[PDB]
Every structure is written in C-alpha cells, then in structure tokens.
C-alpha cells in the first residue's frame, strides 16, 4: 500500500528515484538549527548550536523463520457478473458463468464442483513475496557479512555477530543462498480433473527461458548460510506449477538478470488480475527488508528470539477455468492498481517505505511496554480492541498496522482482512527477564549495566539482565507529529525544573519528574552529567546513546521507584555553546526553537548521496467512472487509534479512546 | 432444513468456510471473562479471570445400527398438471399425460395398469444419505481410532474405548470400510411391462466413469471395522439400481475423490426434481456426525446399547415414466430448493449444525429425565401433545426436533411429517438399571461412586448402577437464551450461606438448591470443597468435570433427605487465577458477572482456527433477483475509444478516457 | 484489432456476438524483452547508425541487431489527418523555426525533441540530406531512413537519452530532384508546407 | 537540477547552466564541467579577486551543452548554507548590507 506509507515521510522530504546501497548499515536523520534561551536567579545567558545531527542506524541483518499457514481468499480479479447484488460469491452464478462460455457443454456440472472447492483457497501473495526477494538479493548482491564485526559498540561493553546470530559463516548475499528449481509443466488443454494441490497460472505469449528459471527458483526452499533479512529461512511452497500458456514453455536457463525478475512480475500480474495479491505482498516485504541497530545495550533483547513469519499456503484455480477470469473485473476500491504502478516505477522507493513502517512500529512499542497489565488497554488486549474486521487471527500485518495508527493518529484501512507477515510483539509478550550476552571492553563494566559477575575483566564474556525492554529507536521521520511528554520531541518548549539544594557537592533528586527534566536541559546545554541511583547504588549518565541527542528515562536501567544523588563537582564540558553553564542557581528556565530540517544519510562513514531524476506523483481518484458509493463496509479492516492521556506517575502510560 | 438449524447458533459466532478437521475430538466452547467478588462481615475481595474457557468435548466415533422401514412417499417434484384441487393423484390425467407423450403406443395401456401402485413409490432420502456418507469419509479421512485409548477419564474411575466397543480393531477411516459395488443395468425403453421392487431413476446426458464407482457403493452393506459415526451399520439399499439414461452408461473406475460425489449429488436431485427428499437426508447426517463424550463417568448408560437409525426403503419408479416429469414441478413451501443450495456452496457447515443439533437435544433430555410419571407431559408423552401433524410413527427426527422447539421455545415446520433417523429416547423409557463398565485409578473410589464392590485394588474391572441418567452435555451454544435454575447458566448469579461465629466454620445446608449454587461458584473461584451427607453417609467434591467446571445437582449420584456438613477449614485451592477463603467468619455473599463472548475451538490439545471466506445467510431472493436481472445488458461488443493527449516530453505517450 | 481501430478512428465499433477468433498482433509488445532480427551488411561503417552487435564488420557478414522499443511499421496514409496526433505530424500545414545567430557558424543546437523531428522531416520533403550528432552519447542520425513515405519519425535515432542534436549546416547534401536548395543561411530559419489535393 | 545519470548532469540549455554555477560560486563549491562540443573544461573558480561568475569564462562564442562533474566537487570555502548535493529545485536568496 503505497498511499499509505508514502504519507509517513516528513513533509519536507522528497527523496529521488534510484539509491546505490554498498554496505550492510545506512544511517538516516536531519541536520536542525537549535536557539537555546537560558534564565535562572544568577541571570541570563543566549546561545545558538548552528548544525546538530540526529539520527537512527538500520541495518539488513535479522534473523527470521518462515510458516505455511491457511489464511483469507482474496476475491479481487473475478468477473463481476458471478458476484450478486451484495459482495458474495454465489455458486447458482458460476454454474451460468461456465455455462455460457464453452461449446462442449457435457463438463460444466463438473466443473461447478471443482470450482466452489477451490475459489474458497485463491492467494498468490506467497509467490510474489519470494520473487520480491529474488530481485533485491541480484540487485543489492554485493553487501558482506563478515562474523567477527560488531553488532553495538558503547565504550564499556560490546556485542559482536558471533553473538545473536550463531550457526554462521563469513558469506556476501549472492554466495548466501543456492537454490534449486521446482518443475514447471505445461497444462494441456484438454485434462478434465483438476489435479489437487498444484496451482496453475495464466500468461501472455510464451513464457521466456529467463522467466521459466524465476518460477522454478520462487517456488523452492531458502536455506541461507548468512543471517540476512531478504534472504530468511521459507518452506517448500510447492513441488509442480502448471502454466496455462497457448505456445509451449522452453527450458530453464540456468542465469537471470534483476531487470528479467520485474518482467516476469508485471506479466504474471496483468494475465492473473492480482493486483490486490501484490499489494499484500509490498506491505509483508516493508516489514521484513531492514532491521533496527539497537540504540542502547539493553535494546538487544528484541532481536534475540527468531520472529516467525507468517506466508499463505499458494492456491490458484486461473489456469483450469480462464472462463472465470474476463475483461470486466471485480475490485473493492478504485485505486487497486495504485501500488504495482508505484513499485515499476520507482523500485528503490521500498527503502524508504520500510524504515518508515519498522520506525514507527519499534517507537510505539517503546510507551506499550511501560502499560502498566491492570486497565483495559493493555499489552495483551490493545490489537483487539483496535481491529473492526473478521480476520483469521490478530497476528502478522493487523499488529504492526495498529501500531502505526497508534503513532499517526489517523484510520487506516485495507480492502481484505490480511493476516500474513512478521509479528514483533513476542519479547514483549512473556514475563520473563532476558539473557543478552555480552564483552566487557573496559574493567568498570558491573557498575554501569546491570551484570550477573559483579568482577570481570577486558575479554571476558558475560551476561546482563533485562526486565523491561527500553526504546529501541527515537523518533526521526515521525518527529513532532504528535508529542508524547516521554520522548519529548518538540519542535518549542520550555522546560522549568526546580535545583535541589547542594549540600557538599551533591545534589539529591527525590521526585522522578523533575531528575527527566534536569539532566534533560543539562544535555542540551552539553553538560556530561553523572548521577548515583541510591536503591540499587549503580552509575546513570545522559551521555548513553550519542547518535541522538536526547535523554529518555529507561537510562536509568530500573524499573520501580528511586532517589538519585547528583555529582555536580564532576560535571565534565564535552559540547560547549555560548548558552552552556556549569552553575546552576534556583529555578531553571530553558526556551529553545527548531528551525532548518534538512534530511542527510551516511553508510560506512561517507554521506550516500540520492542519484536519478525526481519522483513525479502517480495516484488514482476514489471515482473513473462509478456513480454511487456502494459504501460496503461490512469485511473491509478498520484500525481506530489510541490516544496517550499523561498522568502524574510519569513512569507509567495509559491509552484512552479519542 | 438449513434455516432452522442455522437459527440455533450464537449471535457472537461468524462462522467461515472451511474447517481442516485432523482429529476425531474436538472442544468447541467460548472465552468469557468472569468478575468474581467473595463479601464477609471482615472485608471483600475481589477476583478477575481474563480468558475462562467453557468446553464440550464432541467425538466422531458412536454405535449405531440401520434397518430398513416402511415410510410415507414424498410427492414433490411430478408436473402439476396430474394432480387436483386436493393435492393427490387423480388417476385419468395420467392416462391422459402419457397419451399426449413420446411414449411407444404398445406400452400405454400395460403401464397405465401399474401407474396406480408404482407413482406412490417416490423415497430417494435412503440414496442422498449413504452418498452424503461417501462424501465425508473421502474428506476427513485421515482421522485415527486406537483401541487401547481413553474414552473418558475424571482421576477415580476411568472408561476405555476396548469396554464400551468390542470386535473392534484399530484402523483409520478411509481404511475401515470396503465397499462392494452394485450392478448399474441401463433401462431399456421398449420393456414389456415394468419390473416393481427395482427402482429406475433419471439423469442428464451420459452416466461418467466415476459416477457409476459412486451410485454402486451407495447401494451397498456398510460392514465396518472401526466404530465411526459417518461409517456405522447399514444393510443392502438394492441389488440392482435401473438408469434412464439413452447416452450409454460407461463401466466403473474404480477410485474418486470427494468432489466428484458433490457431481454425483447435483446431476441426480435436478434431473429427479427431489429436493425435499435431500432435505430429509441433511436433517438425518446431522443428528449421526458427531456423538458426544460424556461429561461425568456415570453419563456413558446413553452410549451402553446401540441406537436404532430408520432408514426408508429405496423406491423410485421415474425411469419408467419419464413424462411425468419436467421443468414444472408442484410444490408445498416456496423455499423448497434452500437446503440443497446451503449445502453446494457451503458443504463444512454442517459441523456447526450437527453439534448445535445434539447440545440442543442432550440438555432438554437432562431436564426431561428428572420429572415423575404422574404428571401431564411425563418421559413416555411429551412427543404426542407437541406433534401437531400425522406421521407412521414418532421416531427419528420427530422426537429430535421436538426437543429443538422445546429447547429454543419457537414453532418448528417442516413441509412432509417424514419419520426417519436416529432414535435417542431409547434407555430413557426403558426406566431400568444400566450397568456400565470401569477400571479404577486409585483404591477410595466406591465411596464417590455407587459401584457394585465396597473394596476394589487398583487395576480392576468394576461396574457402576445408574439409576436416573444424568445430563450428557452442559448448554454453550444455547448459554442463557432461555435458562433453567437447574442448570443455572445465568450472567449474574449470588448465593448468600448465613453462618454464625459459635459455629467453627462447620454449615450444614438443609434447601439444595443454595448448596447447588454454592458448590458450582466456589469451583470457578478454584476451591476443591468435599461436602458429607449426614443421613446416609456418603462424600460429593465439585470437581466432577474438567470441561465446563459447573456443579450440578445429579452430580451426588443419590435422591434422598438433603442435609450436606461443608467443613470450611479443608477447603484447598487447586487451579491459578482463584480468589483465596482464609478464615471466614460471619455471613458469606459470593457473585460473579460474565460480560463478553468470543468463539474458540481446540483439538489435540493446540487452537483450531476457522479458515476460507465469510459465510452469508443464503435466501431464495439473493439469487432469482440475478434471474430477474438476467444480465439484460445486450451481448453486443461495443468497442469504446481513447483520444491520445501530448504533453511537455512528447517521447512517452499519455490516453485519456474521453 | 477492433478495440485499436475504435482508437485511430475514433468511433464506437458494436459487433451482434462477442466472438473471440483470428489472428493475435500484439505478441512482440507484451514479451517486453529484446528481439535479435538478423541482418546482412552492404558498407563498412553499419554499426555506428544501427545498434548493432559487432563495431568493426567487413562487407557480406551476417550479423545481429538489438531492437529494444518496436518503432511504427506503418505510418498514416488512409487516415491521414483524421485523427491528428504530433508524433507522426501528419498535418496539411506545418511549421518549424531554428534560431541561429551570424556569430554561430552554421552549427545549431537542439535542446528541444518535438521541433528537431519536424526540421529534419520537411528537409527531406526540400531533398536536402541532413547528417546530425548527438553530443552526450557519440552517436549519428540521417534523415533519408527510408523510400516510401519520405518522412522522419523520432524513433529512426534508435536510443532513449538527453537530446543535443549538433547538425552542422554546411555539409547539407542535395540528394532528389523537385528540390529548394539552402547554399548558405544567415539568422533565423523558418520552413513551411501546404498540401491542397489528393489523388 | 538535472538527473544524475552515473555522476554526470547535462545542461543542455544556456541560461540555466549560468544561474546553477552561480549558486554552486556563492555556497563556495569549485565545479568543473566539460564542453561537449569543443572538448576543454570550464571551471566557475575563474577569478578570485571578484567573487562571481561570468558567461564568457566558457570562452566559447555560439552553442553547446555542458557535462558537469558532481563527483569531484571540492569544497574551497564552506559557510553553514553550503551543500554538495542539490536536490530539485534550488532557490537562493541572499542579501548585501554593511559596505565599506
């Protein structure tokens, strides 16, 4: 669904056509112009930071597993006269249907029985979903994996790829997967009894000897040597594929071109009307493509356990009965060939689409975790009272669609009830502590994270602890679309905190509130503050993550209530504006003004420039030629989004209904 | 009838097409959240459990026995013009009908003869059925019987499959039965005179390979080795089975899949034109699918003796007059053709129309069970006032579909008074001792149960007396539509036990109908309370299920004086998510609230999720409105043209519509 | 075939049965891949106008040429100036004007796609054989690419890319007879034509 | 700004390509182009007394179209306004006070 995660790129973003990927890691932000204003009791003080970067890093590694499972049929690309007066499929219209369009009579009863067996278990979603992947993996098949590089890298503890990813070798993408070819037959017209479980398809022409070597290698198992994210683990999808084509089909080649895989994609769209199939497809892959680098050490535990990937069984019933499919399709909504059009055009786009999509699902996941299981939105009830559809289960795409309703804060609909792709939300579903293993770099380790050997030393390999599972990335794309008092990602704000009285030189902070607001204000200013958390008596710094540079209260690394004791002696200057103070006096008053975005991306240490021409907008009206809204909202999905009332905890959030 | 059976199901239940069977158990029930609340003069306190599943246990295995009756004729379906003012065959416009005809002149007045006793032989329900059978086993045939499994168990007594069915061996349901196939002659047109007690039926065009496979199985001995429900004891319908077919019947295949019997089925009931004699085979199937497992041990004196299924004799004399029907048939009810329609395009729906059949029936005859003899509507006449037509005899869906009405409170009508199928209400009025079988677990169980030994070492064969049956099945699907205090299925319910502080916990319950109410709430609260019986000395515990966890009344096994000592210091707390009785002390007041309701279904101990598209409420009108329609736009290519539009590039090509 | 006539004619075309019987003409188009039509050369310097396979060919060789968009088979005769589009120009009056400068000497630039078609089109209706180069890719274009129509279509330059067109207007060769001869221009350029009667 | 085909933007038309250099000059980018015509390279950085670009630094009387190097764009002298890569369309508006 291209709309709709087009929508999500800030507004003043407009990215080119093609993007030359060289490397396994891109960082993306913007660079902003910050006015910091600064009043306390001793005085005044103005300054400007002229050029501030932040940003997120994504990268293509994450380890997934594929299953076959039985899903919704996707009645979109039938003729439109077996359809009744309402959106139901009738068997007393098929038998017409079939009747009228053939000389040779004797076979429709036959046929009519056959046919209400298999319309019911239409899907090819599967198939274009594996051909997606085939393209990128020649396109981008040149990025390496190599197994003793680093995963995070802070400064006191480290995570190589060894680690999160055993049963691996050193391998680039082309080298990772050797697949085999299933047979593709062709159907004689003439055979009477369908075969069971073998789908046929249509085609225009005859099918190229390149074309014949995709179909074999779609249809076949992954089994892949590297962890990669377009190239995970799938099962078998079947063992023959008939091919209802006039002139006969030539032998497998052997070699392909990424530029023959989007030639057999727009043919096997345009003979079989699935064009609704692909757009189910586009969004599973949005979600698969790119994973988060974690923004803190604790931010690991997402990625430890494999997320299942849920891929419809393949059925099509097209190539037996090409009567059922004419010139006069069945389509819900207008705009059904809106995202095909799209993906032709502008194949590098997807990119894009999918750091938007994976950004705002791993930030809404960030408020979801610190529900409190006590009120009725909660972690295990939030997707259910969300959908108002039928679908077969709450899993895969309904769960990360109700996520991006959640930030967005506006309805988002699809034509058919989907439940097909990656579900995220199984870390956070278990009331079990996490196991992240880890390297200690330096000695003073045990005192920062919460460490199972309180004594190490550089080299050992140990264990940390994870309880609740903090933000794994900051809102960059999705910056001030709507402000959350946790993240605090205002575009204006003034922040006014109280200064705890320093006795000696150290300052204690009671309330949890007012510590947020402090070392928040202390870090703008640039100011590497170190705070002693008395209950559990381990170190917190607002120097955590330096790619974005905020302070989020899950640093603190605890769970529950607390008081802090503030070093203000050993209060280090590592960025210093002309606004920046060491001494501060009464009540603090900081007014600052973002002004000047400009989007900028970096891979491998360089900035990786856009190439190409302009994108020119495509899109479809609600009306070509269709006088009344037959409104049929009966099976179309309706995901209703939950607002964040703030209340005075500030450790817990709550959802209402809006 | 589709419709009345479709009524009976939940308004929360949207059921979907298809359902992948792979089991013979299967625990269909609800999730309802349940707000429990235990008030004491020392405070309240309050329970919650999200997710409490209400289950019955359906199997697909049950002993049951056909014979072959004598049954009134079905005369739907002869053109309209023999019959009179009345509704019955007035002799002379047949004589005058085959006049007027293609018959051969030489036969007229020989096969006006018989006309009087061979136009009354008009039962094809006998045929429909068996081939309905044929279907199902081809389906679901994957579904295992071990002989050495359990049947039922509670912890104390245990039932196996070997006590219940022996001269059973163990083997899977496409391997149990062997078919033998009967002769499939062709009907020659110049017979001398007609042959009676061989039926001849119609059919379009030629007679397939595989058709001639089916038709000779469905007229044939079902002798199994496995006790099936979808595969019990039939004899030979027919030794040999005439076809009018003047395109030449084609010799048997051998093997057919199950959508080659849906051919079968369609081809025969429109070239007969019998409709109502399909709906009278639907309405049997659905009564002997699926049998229940009982809910208590001493619930097996239901399935102790094999019930009796009234098959009537195939007889059908079409062949021979092939005039007399056409494209004009006379019918009673309008709505004549709904059954059959339901069933093409949705054939697993009966599953859900077979267990809301039984759960209807096994309730109200739980209820029926316990009324004295000296009563109006008593256990030998509740059938007789009810019935309100002129059936042979009351047996076989008469009897069922009285308790239906009685059960759901509303005027069943069917368009015949056919009396064919199984027979329930047979150890009911027997009014004798049933003695069922039992191998104990541990070494206290004749205590709980009235068994024949007082003293009985683990590992032994028992036997159980049942004098008053006990109900098989609680209501689910029928859940406070239209409640009893018996089984007390309310939404909210409370129960107030006056105890006095001088009293050390010991309460006596002199009404039983509190102590009903009592037992059963303390269990959804998980609290294993064990009363004593003063007078006669014997022990009842409230868990006595692990399916629907209620406490009835007849779970005390004996009807006597009720005076039951609840010792409320051994009251020990069994299951999770419970509400905790200390030390209680003054009067107890228990409630609960069931607010919400949402379908679930499990087999071999993992989620059975319902797959395919979403069934609608077929109606006569949905489809003769597309008849009314009739595609009335002309069927005349017109070829609409599009105007090339230039713009800025002038190398790309733009059209507009206009 | 009726459906692309209602197109070119444009009119509505009814039929009393919707019969689905002949010959299928859109094969090549739909495939959407490259064809390798096979040729014999007659001169040496072949592959520098064609795409050819080979960029050094000795005279009576087979080679191949890799056609990538299918250009026009035929162009509009019976329907010439029915249903006008300005691809193929086929208009009774048309004209064109190049703006030169005295200080250029004689070398033109077209920066424009639409206007160098219809110069090098009515220069061959002159007689005038007009050679242009395109600046980007290196590759040469002539006006005179065929003997039937004596017209030129903007798919004779065989690529899709940026246009730069250098023509050069002091090596213009008169070729037919019936022809206006330009010995040497100064300033602005402006041709036109008018067709009055059809036999 | 023209597509970047493989690093190289063609400037087809006159004017344009005098207002883009003009830009690329005042940010403080040194680009050098190539005439596809006469072949020889035109650099904006022609003189440096006088902060600006002139048409006739082409040093090339008629018509022609420029290939222009976006790889090899160095970065002479950056303010905080200065970018490498232009994106669409480039508006500049700049103002002069305090002469001395």
Same mark, same amino acid.
């Given at each position: 669904m291209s709309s709709l995660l087009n929508?999500?790129?800030?507004?003043?973003f407009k990215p080119k056509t093609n993007l030359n990927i060289n490397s396994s890691r891109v960082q993306y932000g913007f660079n902003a112009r910050i006015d910091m204003q600064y009043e306390d009791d001793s005085g005044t003080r103005k300054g400007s930071r002229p050029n501030a970067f932040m940003s997120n890093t994504v990268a293509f590694i994450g380890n997934y597993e594929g299953i076959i499972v039985d899903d919704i049929p996707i009645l979109d690309?039938?003729?439109?006269?077996?359809?009744?007066?309402?959106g139901d499929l009738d068997m007393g219209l098929v038998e017409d249907a079939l009747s009228k369009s053939?000389?040779?009579?004797?076979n429709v009863p036959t046929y009519t029985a056959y046919a209400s067996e298999l319309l019911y278990k239409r899907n090819l979603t599967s198939l274009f979903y594996n051909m997606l992947r085939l393209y990128y993996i020649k396109k981008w098949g040149s990025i390496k994996y190599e197994?003793?590089?680093?995963?995070?890298?802070?400064?006191?503890a480290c995570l190589l790829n060894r680690q999160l990813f055993p049963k691996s070798r050193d391998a680039s993408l082309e080298s990772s997967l050797s697949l085999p070819e299933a047979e593709i037959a062709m159907l004689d017209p003439g055979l009477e009894f369908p075969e069971e479980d073998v789908p046929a398809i249509l085609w225009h022409g005859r099918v190229s000897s390149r074309a014949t070597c995709i179909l074999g290698q779609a249809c076949s198992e992954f089994a892949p040597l590297a962890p990669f994210s377009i190239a995970h683990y799938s099962p078998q999808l079947t063992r023959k594929l008939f091919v209802n084509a006039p002139a006969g089909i030539e032998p497998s080649s052997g070699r392909y071109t990424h530029e023959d895989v989007k030639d057999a994609i727009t043919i096997l769209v345009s003979a079989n009307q699935a064009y609704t199939d692909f757009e189910a497809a586009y969004l599973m892959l949005a979600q698969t493509l790119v994973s988060p680098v974690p923004r803190?050490?604790?931010?690991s535990a997402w990625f430890i356990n494999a997320g299942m990937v849920n891929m419809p069984t393949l059925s099509c019933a097209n190539g037996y009965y090409?009567?059922?499919?004419?010139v006069n399709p069945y389509h819900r909504?207008?705009?059904?060939?809106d995202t095909l059009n799209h993906w032709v055009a502008y194949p590098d786009m997807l990119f894009y689409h999918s750091v938007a999509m994976i950004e705002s699902c791993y930030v809404e996941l960030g408020n979801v975790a610190r529900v409190?299981?006590?009120?009725?939105?909660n972690k295990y009830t939030f997707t259910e009272l969300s959908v108002q559809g039928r679908p077969?289960?709450?899993?895969?795409?309904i769960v990360d669609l109700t996520l991006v309703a959640m930030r967005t804060g506006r309805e988002i609909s699809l034509p058919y009830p989907v439940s097909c792709g990656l579900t995220r939300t199984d870390a956070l579903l278990q009331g079990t502590e996490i196991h992240v293993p880890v390297v200690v770099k330096?000695?003073?380790?045990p005192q920062y994270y919460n460490a199972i050997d309180k004594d190490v030393i550089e080299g050992q390999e140990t264990v940390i602890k994870v309880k609740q599972l903090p933000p794994a990335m900051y809102p960059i794309?999705?910056?001030?679309i709507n402000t959350t008092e946790? =993240?605090? @990602?205002?575009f204006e704000d003034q922040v006014q905190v109280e200064m705890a009285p320093i006795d000696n030189g150290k300052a204690v902070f009671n309330d949890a509130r007012k510590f947020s607001k402090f070392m928040s204000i202390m870090r703008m200013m640039g100011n590497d503050v170190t705070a002693t958390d008395?209950?559990?008596?381990r170190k917190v710094s607002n120097?955590?993550?330096?790619?974005?540079?905020r302070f989020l209260y899950?640093?603190?690394?605890?769970e529950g209530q607390t008081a802090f004791l503030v070093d203000?002696?050993?209060?280090?200057?590592r960025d210093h504006c002309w606004?920046?103070?060491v001494d501060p006096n009464g009540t603090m008053n900081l007014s600052y003004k973002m002004t000047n975005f400009r989007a900028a991306m970096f891979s491998r240490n360089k900035p990786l420039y856009m190439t190409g021409g302009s994108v020119r907008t495509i899109a479809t009206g609600? =009306?070509? @030629?269709?006088?009344?809204?037959?409104?049929?909202?009966?099976?179309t999905l309706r995901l209703k989004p939950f607002k964040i009332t703030e209340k005075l905890d500030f450790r817990v959030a709550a959802y209402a209904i809006p």
């Open positions: 929508s999500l790129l800030p507004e003043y690309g039938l003729r439109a006269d077996i359809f009744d007066t309402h053939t000389m040779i009579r004797r197994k003793d590089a680093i995963f995070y890298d802070n400064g006191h803190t050490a604790e931010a090409p009567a059922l499919t004419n909504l207008d705009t059904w060939k409190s299981d006590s009120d009725a939105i077969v289960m709450n899993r895969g795409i330096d000695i003073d380790m794309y999705t910056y001030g946790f =993240y605090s @990602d205002h008395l209950v559990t008596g120097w955590a993550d330096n790619s974005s540079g899950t640093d603190v690394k605890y203000m002696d050993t209060v280090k200057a606004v920046s103070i609600n =009306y070509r @030629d269709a006088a009344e809204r037959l409104r049929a909202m009966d099976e």
